[PDB]
Design a protein around this ligand. Sequence first.
Ligand SMILES: O=C(Nc1ccc(Cl)cn1)[C@H]1CN(CC(F)F)C[C@@H]1C(=O)Nc1ccc(-n2ccccc2=O)cc1F
Ligand SMILES: [Ca+2]
Ligand code: NA
Lengths: 234, 43
Amino acid sequence: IVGGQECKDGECPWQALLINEENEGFCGGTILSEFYILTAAHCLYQAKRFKVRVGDRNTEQEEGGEAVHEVEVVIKHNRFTKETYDFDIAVLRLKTPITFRMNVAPACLPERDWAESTLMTQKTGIVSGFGRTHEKGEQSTRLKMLEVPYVDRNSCKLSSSFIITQNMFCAGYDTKQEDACQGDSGGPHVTRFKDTYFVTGIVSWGEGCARKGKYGIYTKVTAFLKWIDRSMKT
Amino acid sequence: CSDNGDCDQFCVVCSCARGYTLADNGKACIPTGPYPCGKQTLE
Ligand SMILES: O=C(Nc1ccc(Cl)cn1)[C@H]1CN(CC(F)F)C[C@@H]1C(=O)Nc1ccc(-n2ccccc2=O)cc1F
Ligand SMILES: [Ca+2]
Ligand code: NA
């Protein structure tokens, strides 16, 4: 996260962190239930073997509530390709169930049609993660969050070197130096409706981070609500 | 439906995400446990 703030205790409880054999974070995830994590399909290419850490806010301090889970099943969208970065979604089934607690709770999955008309039409969402604090810099040891405005699809297509598909959406700022960055990849984008947070995006890609004239690109979760439902039931 | 048909969550006919039940008003959503989805946690 470039800009933004550190998550306070209990503020980003649906954040998950994918850790490699070095015990290093390389991607985020969203807790969907006691057994399921939502992530980006592109994250699966980074480490052959990985685990999931929940409840962490500081990667340098082992604090109460942190727990590690092994992944039992990886469900990657069969249409994902690095050529287009389209269909950038995967669901992970954990071997053991997560115990919900302080800093560990799921984001809500919305109903499709309602989400298209009611959530995707809100002004902003919140992106969070342990990713780079600058395009050229290091990953954050602290969990950060950032409020990002939804960006018009056509303004985003004009700004982009690459095709923006209907399975994507854009969020962020044109020149303000705030955005998600590499390492937040796979992590949550949530939208508040009244007093509840619904998962609306997956951190997917961007041309650098917080670049002037460039936006953050997210997988559009509404496009995959049936897919997610089937994956959580298989 | 939409002032969201006065609903707290989905939609005039309301509904809520898993881990909530629709209140007696038929417009509000009540958590069924201590860690319902989409709520920030408190000590
Ligand atoms: O992760 C990134 N930025 C970022 C910023 C905001 C959000 Cl929300 C998410 N990610 C950037 C920064 N990182 C460098 C440093 F910050 F680490 C390299 C990475 C990249 O070039 N991605 C990247 C760029 C383009 C494509 N892409 C898109 C469409 C078709 C083909 C294609 O390759 C795929 C990518 F992953
Ligand atoms: Ca920690
Ligand atoms: Na920008």
